[PDB]
């Protein structure tokens, strides 16, 4: 809303961070961690 | 502390200044906790009692400020308190008791019901109720496991002498009967009539549950009777209190204002008496407001609707009396300046803080769990119409409050939930909206006649507020409900007269052209009829010659042809031909000021508004989009018009006497979206190369300048600083369009490297190197952007992109 690119800032190093996802009732998702780059779509669009 | 505060502040004591700023500070610090149904934080959500306290506070302060003599200091300190209090007070709140006693340190009036005559047709069951209440005392003891005993019991810790009535000496029966006598005799004293409903006159198991359902009026009587009890013991309580001389008892406050936790004894006593009446056969006889009117939104808006006619009353004869002799006579100067110094900022902040609740619909809940009622929506619309009618052809008279009134009119132009105004709404209020539009059309027609006072009124008040209305309609897609029936015809003659202003070439209309272009662009974005390209205008449903009646065309003088209505506006193909000729000729802003400030805003707001009504978007919903696209604007048309815009900017980067690039870029920001890829090498690459070459040459000149440092270097510095200001001006004139273009086509370049895009990055990189190497370039950037206030547009452009 303020126009900032980063959603969260000032994150301490902590113990580390892990990919996580929460699914509501009757929801289907595909958690592609990025094992295969060709399967990983839009990575070249944002991240390569 | 808030309870005592609500007690003291409505009196507007001259020593209550500190409590006044206390309310101010409290309700700016803590406003989410009071207003939002979602809790602020660990604190939580506000209490109903506190909400009622600030409610009664704020209405009381409102009326007390309306009736107290106008004091500049007191009013100035009071109005931030009013704004903060109203901001933290939720609009949809409904009060505990809309109609109640509302009585008036404290002197509650007692009841001399011993002197008041008491009939003996009821005293029999009053005595029976006295015995029944002492029996219920014994029942409370047996609940407390100290079952009533005849003799003194040390372990009982309760009443030591209570006995069954046979052995119970009547000397004490009289002294427990007499308080009940005073109780119900006061109940019959406060204009309430009791009698046996059915035929009729030491431990009663059946109790009287005070929490059972009961009628509104009789329960209000029960509350009033609990207040009566509070007055009865409160007179002797304050008799003892005034002997002390300081402090007060927590229950020595008005019964309606005090908290729910402390009124438990009086409430239980009064309600248990009333349930005893209902259950045992006693009828007693001594408002009906709906929840919508019970809301503070409706209550405050009722005060506001009352304020408009009051205001117009004194200001009309005030301008009359200052136009005839300048006599200082006022009906109520305190109330006149009360409005002029308090109400304008109050509505200014209220219709911005609670705009979302007003705009929120039960169907489409824009607010966070809070929406107004349809009733509220049409009469805020009528509120806006009344405020407009207050200053209709009159804003020249108001000089001291002129920015305030015009600003408030912008805010009421926004937050206009008008979808539910023609629907389930009063057609008198809809006629008020029609009268607004027709009066605006008549006044703008007078304006164009004089343009070839009311004209200055059109300059300051009507034009920006009407532009805000067109912005609001375009943004919230309210064209189907706001502009319809005669409003369509009034807007038709308005747009014809504004395009006539675009035709006229005098200096005054030339100066006014920016606001006219803003108004016409917003009008086209809010316009549901394809006025331009009238070839297939009959297919558009919203046109009068498709929906409105032939008979009403006959009686309104409509020529049954949109071209015959407004032949001033020509075909989009001829606009294409004209702008193409100007682009090919390299024509100047001085040659075409009318196009820039009238027709370019209309076009760049017409193609995106009608991008679905044209061949650019065939209807994805095939059954719903049965008629063929009435509009003719395509993606090809959008690309070509973008080419024309790029062509005019590349025509006159060279000149420096053009400050309309800011509004040009703002208008063209949506029209740079959905641009074809070849547009890059056609126009974007040539332009960016042009300013790359210009930046290189100008920095070379600044290089030969920075080679030296003296007074001659200073005058050359003035020349190159003007050059730098032109550089910054056109960089942030054309960059905002470029960022959306590259946002559109970045995916294609990332999937396949496009040499045009890579060369574009090379060009902008060279300008970046020049900007880093040139110190004076940076400070002229800072100077221009902040002094001319491009920074706000830069932040908006970077946020949207």
Curated annotation (Swiss-Prot), chain B:
Domain observations: The calcium release channel activity resides in the C-terminal region while the remaining part of the protein constitutes the 'foot' structure spanning the junctional gap between the sarcoplasmic reticulum (SR) and the T-tubule. Pore opening is mediated via the cytoplasmic calcium-binding domains that mediate a small rotation of the channel-forming transmembrane regions that then leads to channel opening.
Recorded superkingdom: Eukaryota
Range within the parent protein: 2622 to 3475 of 5037
Stated family: Belongs to the ryanodine receptor (TC 1.A.3.1) family. RYR1 subfamily.
Species per Swiss-Prot/TrEMBL record: Oryctolagus cuniculus
Full protein name: Ryanodine receptor 1
PTM: The N-terminus is blocked. Channel activity is modulated by phosphorylation.
Each Sequence repeat, start to end: 105-201, 202-300
Role description: Cytosolic calcium-activated calcium channel that mediates the release of Ca(2+) from the sarcoplasmic reticulum into the cytosol and thereby plays a key role in triggering muscle contraction following depolarization of T-tubules. Repeated very high-level exercise increases the open probability of the channel and leads to Ca(2+) leaking into the cytoplasm. Can also mediate the release of Ca(2+) from intracellular stores in neurons, and may thereby promote prolonged Ca(2+) signaling in the brain. Required for normal embryonic development of muscle fibers and skeletal muscle.
Note from the entry: Binding of [3H]ryanodine indicates that the heterozygous channel is activated by Ca(2+) concentrations 4-fold lower than normal. Single-cell analysis of cotransfected cells shows a significantly increased resting cytoplasmic Ca(2+) level and a significantly reduced luminal Ca(2+) level.
Tissue-by-tissue expression: Detected in skeletal muscle (at protein level). Fast- or slow-twitch skeletal muscle.
Subunit structure: Homotetramer. Can also form heterotetramers with RYR2. Identified in a complex composed of RYR1, PDE4D, PKA, FKBP1A and protein phosphatase 1 (PP1). Repeated very high-level exercise decreases interaction with PDE4D and protein phosphatase 1 (PP1). Interacts with CALM; CALM with bound calcium inhibits the RYR1 channel activity. Interacts with S100A1. Interacts with FKBP1A; this stabilizes the closed conformation of the channel. Interacts with CACNA1S; interaction with CACNA1S is important for activation of the RYR1 channel. Interacts with CACNB1.
Localization, UniProt: Sarcoplasmic reticulum membrane
